[PDB]
Structure 1
Amino acid sequence: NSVFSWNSKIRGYARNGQPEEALSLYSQMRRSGIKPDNYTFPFVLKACASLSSLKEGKQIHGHVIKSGFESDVYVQSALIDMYAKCGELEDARKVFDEMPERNVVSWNAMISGYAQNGQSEEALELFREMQQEGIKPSEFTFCSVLSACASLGSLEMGKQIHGYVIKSGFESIVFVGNALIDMYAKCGSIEDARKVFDEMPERTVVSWTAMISGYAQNGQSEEALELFREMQREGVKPDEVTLPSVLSACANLGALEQGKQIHAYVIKSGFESDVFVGSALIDMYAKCGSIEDARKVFDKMPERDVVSWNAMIAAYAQHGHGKEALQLFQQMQQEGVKPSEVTFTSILSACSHAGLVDEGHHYFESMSPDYGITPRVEHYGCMVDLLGRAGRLDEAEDLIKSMPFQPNVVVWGTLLGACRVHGDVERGERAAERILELDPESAAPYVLLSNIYAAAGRWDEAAKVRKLMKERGVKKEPGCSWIEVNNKVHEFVAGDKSHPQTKEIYAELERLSKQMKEAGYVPDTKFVLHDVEEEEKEQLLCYHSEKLAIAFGLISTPPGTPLRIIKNLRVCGDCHTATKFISKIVGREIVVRDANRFHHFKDGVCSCGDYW
């Protein structure tokens, strides 16, 4: 016999998903006295990479040295790919540098090894070095560096690689089209991603999934759903990767009935038992204001891993069911499910929204000694929110300084929001400037500080803050409220008159306002950000978008039915008070999801405890 027979059988096993059989063959060849050649080693090393077995891979490296093939280009490229897929990028790089000759396959193995393992900068650096030497990149090369740009968020870089793909005539390769959509979406230019998606002559389910995900991640949930319907019209079958993004779009919109329709499709198509689909269903029901249906999904799941537990814990957290989240955190450990840093963000968030100060401190301090997990900046952010709700503003600011991280806008905004609740003008002042230094084009610090000054009677400084905001050309996005009625999502802006039942909506607000007034409600116009007469301020206040949505819900659903409102920005203090009164008057539960919290208004009381 000869090595050519063995190579044929090893090639067969290695390319049919039987790496262990290929390696078992390689061992037999060794005993039989037939020596491998430069064609055997890539297949056996690829088998090692398929199993993520560094030990055997290192043994084969030893055989490559002894056999005198330390200079063969294909063997060395196979060594690179083996070390990379085994999580040893330094060993792979060492092999790449010592090579006496490299072809394009060797560069792709090293570049892709970096991109697939997070080191996006070194991947692009390697790619720049590759182009100076004049080595033509293949379509796989471009897919790797496009994924590196997507990770880094550098849009201008991806635009460059896009031109390079146009130059190399790869723009019609299906994989390249998918990689470009993914890059543009994650870099923020969703229109250019759609431009690529429409131009593709051939689209797979991966192509549709990338376009749908991009829309869903950039908040554009309606276009995601429209493309998901279009995808069914063209005959492209969604799979277990498509559905989470579709569910995420439903989650953002808060359309509970649209979510249940996608849930039934999930059941029809047999994807319900998929673990990411189930976690997405939990999140979707939670985000749609139905903690009961999220719990039903969780309870009937045949398989519950860490992301399923995290999703259900996070679901209870954002609804302020703090004790239930912690009960689940305990139950999850008793069932042998190890927490992650995501679990701790959720249970610390649960302690925040429910005011469990002592519980939050103990969990946070227990992260490093009692688990393997060192706190990240979001865990410190949760703690700053916890201290803020407790009125311990000094502790919270000191924690921001004493933090072993760079303070970000989230952590300062948390403190700034806490300053508004507790009337801490000077600390609010400091927190605002810190936010402006980090993000000068954000409107939230200006509006917040103006509110601070106004509540404290400092009308002059409040006006100068608003004046400075207009000067710097910074504008806040208009408010917006959505409500699902009869399987349709109705949108309202402040003072809306475009709805076909405007007459009945405004008439219902008139009737309702008479009952609120008789119950003690007194409009507070102090923070109507409009330089107009008092009587005009009260008229604007009457028709803030969440009260239009509540009124539409009241005339469109039978009495006693819960109402579920989604607000894009924030529920102003007067609408929060107003909705407390309304919930008792109409005998309904009213659920408002604003940017930060879930407000459950029940019998004159809100679940947030008047801190948001």
Structure 2
Amino acid sequence: GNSVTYNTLISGLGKAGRLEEALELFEEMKEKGIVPSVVTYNTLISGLGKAGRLEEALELFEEMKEKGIVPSVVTYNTLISGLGKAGRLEEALELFEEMKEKGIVPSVVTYNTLISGLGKAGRLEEALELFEEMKEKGIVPSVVTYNTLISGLGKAGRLEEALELFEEMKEKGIVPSVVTYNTLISGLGKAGRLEEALELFEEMKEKGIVPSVVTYNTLISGLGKAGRLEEALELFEEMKEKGIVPSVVTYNTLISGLGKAGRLEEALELFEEMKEKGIVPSVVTYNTLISGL
């Protein structure tokens, strides 16, 4: 047993999940003073990552550094992924800087990862810039990345820039996720801009993706306060003739907007129809029927 034996053996242990034994195997691949392969390090360290075991992985990465062994994307990208899941962002950005300083090219999933991170930790403006580096060196922003920026801006209330990133999204060709559109919906909705919203709902239902219940709900909430009851009923019987389950929020909304605009009976049979589908009639609905008699 020299080298590649050990390595493939580790390929097997690794895939089997028998990792501690692999680490110990490394201990015997080191005690007698031997050098493993970059492949081995990659896999072993990847396992180290997946199973949380991160710091040891870093130390082994440094050990690899003192061995002259050159990392390779998936290596770094892993490290990064690890540090990111644990939110140790800045250190990972540091190592990423090391990466680009040693000539190795950050991938797309790389930036995607960083951005996932920095977005999660809110520091957005630091990351938009990473993303713009990302375009300036060519690498295509996958839907992941974009949607990240989108949710970011969304909760940050930059609004406009996002829509730009959104209308430069579809134009670039890539497909806008569902979560995207529903979040955008939250965007325009909060701002109470029904028009541009609904038209983006038109722009989404025309591309082959299906709106979540949340979209409907909020939409008809905005409309719920907007007094355009009719088109809301339209979207909600459409909701029926689309399959989506009307949440208690939605039903309570319609019934409240109907409780805002009299009609009475329709809402009562809507209340029956609400029960027949199994639901928890919230007291606010009841009080809605109170404030209308």
Q: Tell me the TM-score normalised to structure 1 length.
A: 0.36
Q: 1:265 maps to what in 2?
A: 242
Please say if 1:281 is aligned against 2:253: no
8 Å Cα contact 1:158/1:184 also seen in 2: no
Rounded to whole Å, the distance in 2 between the matches of 1:248 and 1:94 is 50
Rounded to whole Å, the distance in 2 between the matches of 1:118 and 1:179 is 16
Q: 1:57 maps to what in 2?
A: 19
Q: Deviations over 1:104-142 (max 9, x none)?
A: 222110111122344445444443454455543111110
Rounded to whole Å, the distance in 2 between the matches of 1:604 and 1:237 is 39
Report the secondary structure of 1:171's partner residue.
Answer: coil
- Give the drift of 1:149: 1.8
AA partner of residue 233 (structure 1): E
Q: 1:249 maps to what in 2?
A: 218
- Give the drift of 1:143: 0.0
- Give the drift of 1:162: 1.8
Q: 1:73 maps to what in 2?
A: 38
Q: Deviations over 1:542-600 (max 9, x none)?
A: xxxxxxx94xx14xx257856x9xxxxxxxxxxxxxxxxxxxxxxxxxxxx9xxx8892
- Equivalences for 1:403-414 in 2 at 5 Å? none
1:202 to 157, 173, 176: 173
Higher strand share: 1
Rounded to whole Å, the distance in 2 between the matches of 1:123 and 1:187 is 24
- Equivalences for 1:138-177 in 2 at 5 Å? 138-171=107-140, 173-177=142-146
Q: 1:350 maps to what in 2?
A: none
Q: 2:280 maps to what in 1?
A: none
- Equivalences for 1:379-458 in 2 at 5 Å? none
Rounded to whole Å, the distance in 2 between the matches of 1:252 and 1:70 is 64
Rounded to whole Å, the distance in 2 between the matches of 1:70 and 1:285 is 66
Report the secondary structure of 1:163's partner residue.
Answer: helix
Rounded to whole Å, the distance in 2 between the matches of 1:194 and 1:144 is 22
1:116 to 82, 85, 95: 85
- Give the drift of 1:158: 1.7
Q: Deviations over 1:160-191 (max 9, x none)?
A: 11221022201355554444434443443333
Rounded to whole Å, the distance in 1 between the matches of 2:179 and 2:151 is 6
The 1:598/1:282 distance shift into structure 2, 3 A limit, reads: closer
AA partner of residue 194 (structure 1): L
8 Å Cα contact 2:135/2:141 also seen in 1: no
Please say if 1:84 is aligned against 2:49: yes
Rounded to whole Å, the distance in 2 between the matches of 1:244 and 1:93 is 43
Rounded to whole Å, the distance in 2 between the matches of 1:259 and 1:124 is 47
- Give the drift of 1:151: 0.6
Rounded to whole Å, the distance in 2 between the matches of 1:135 and 1:86 is 26
Q: 1:229 maps to what in 2?
A: 202
Rounded to whole Å, the distance in 2 between the matches of 1:71 and 1:124 is 27
8 Å Cα contact 1:79/1:95 also seen in 2: no
8 Å Cα contact 1:89/1:113 also seen in 2: yes
Report the secondary structure of 1:218's partner residue.
Answer: helix
Rounded to whole Å, the distance in 2 between the matches of 1:251 and 1:95 is 55
Rounded to whole Å, the distance in 1 between the matches of 2:240 and 2:265 is 27
* Unpaired stretches in structure 2, ≥5 consecutive residues: 225-231, 271-282
AA partner of residue 66 (structure 1): E
AA partner of residue 160 (structure 1): E
Rounded to whole Å, the distance in 2 between the matches of 1:137 and 1:121 is 16
Please say if 1:193 is aligned against 2:162: yes
Report the secondary structure of 2:287's partner residue.
Answer: strand
AA partner of residue 600 (structure 1): N
AA partner of residue 38 (structure 2): V
* Unpaired stretches in structure 1, ≥5 consecutive residues: 1-29, 273-279, 291-482, 486-548, 565-592, 606-612
8 Å Cα contact 2:189/2:222 also seen in 1: no
Rounded to whole Å, the distance in 1 between the matches of 2:251 and 2:200 is 21
Tell me which of the two structures has the higher relative contact order, counting C-alpha pairs closer than 8 angstroms and 6 or more residues apart.
Answer: 2
Please say if 1:600 is aligned against 2:292: no
8 Å Cα contact 1:213/1:245 also seen in 2: yes
The 1:171/1:63 distance shift into structure 2, 3 A limit, reads: same
Q: Deviations over 1:32-79 (max 9, x none)?
A: xx973546645753x35xxxx5xx222222234434676432322222
8 Å Cα contact 2:116/2:145 also seen in 1: no
- Give the drift of 1:285: 3.8
8 Å Cα contact 1:263/1:281 also seen in 2: no
Rounded to whole Å, the distance in 1 between the matches of 2:265 and 2:219 is 26
8 Å Cα contact 2:220/2:254 also seen in 1: no
- Give the drift of 1:209: 1.9
The 1:266/1:604 distance shift into structure 2, 3 A limit, reads: closer
The 1:604/1:245 distance shift into structure 2, 3 A limit, reads: closer
Q: Superposition RMSD on alpha carbons, in Å? A: 4.1
The 1:125/1:172 distance shift into structure 2, 3 A limit, reads: closer
- Give the drift of 1:262: 2.8
8 Å Cα contact 1:139/1:176 also seen in 2: no
The 1:285/1:601 distance shift into structure 2, 3 A limit, reads: closer
Rounded to whole Å, the distance in 1 between the matches of 2:236 and 2:160 is 26
8 Å Cα contact 1:219/1:252 also seen in 2: no
Q: Tell me the TM-score normalised to structure 2 length.
A: 0.67
Aligned pair count reads 258
Q: Which has the larger radius of gyration?
A: 1
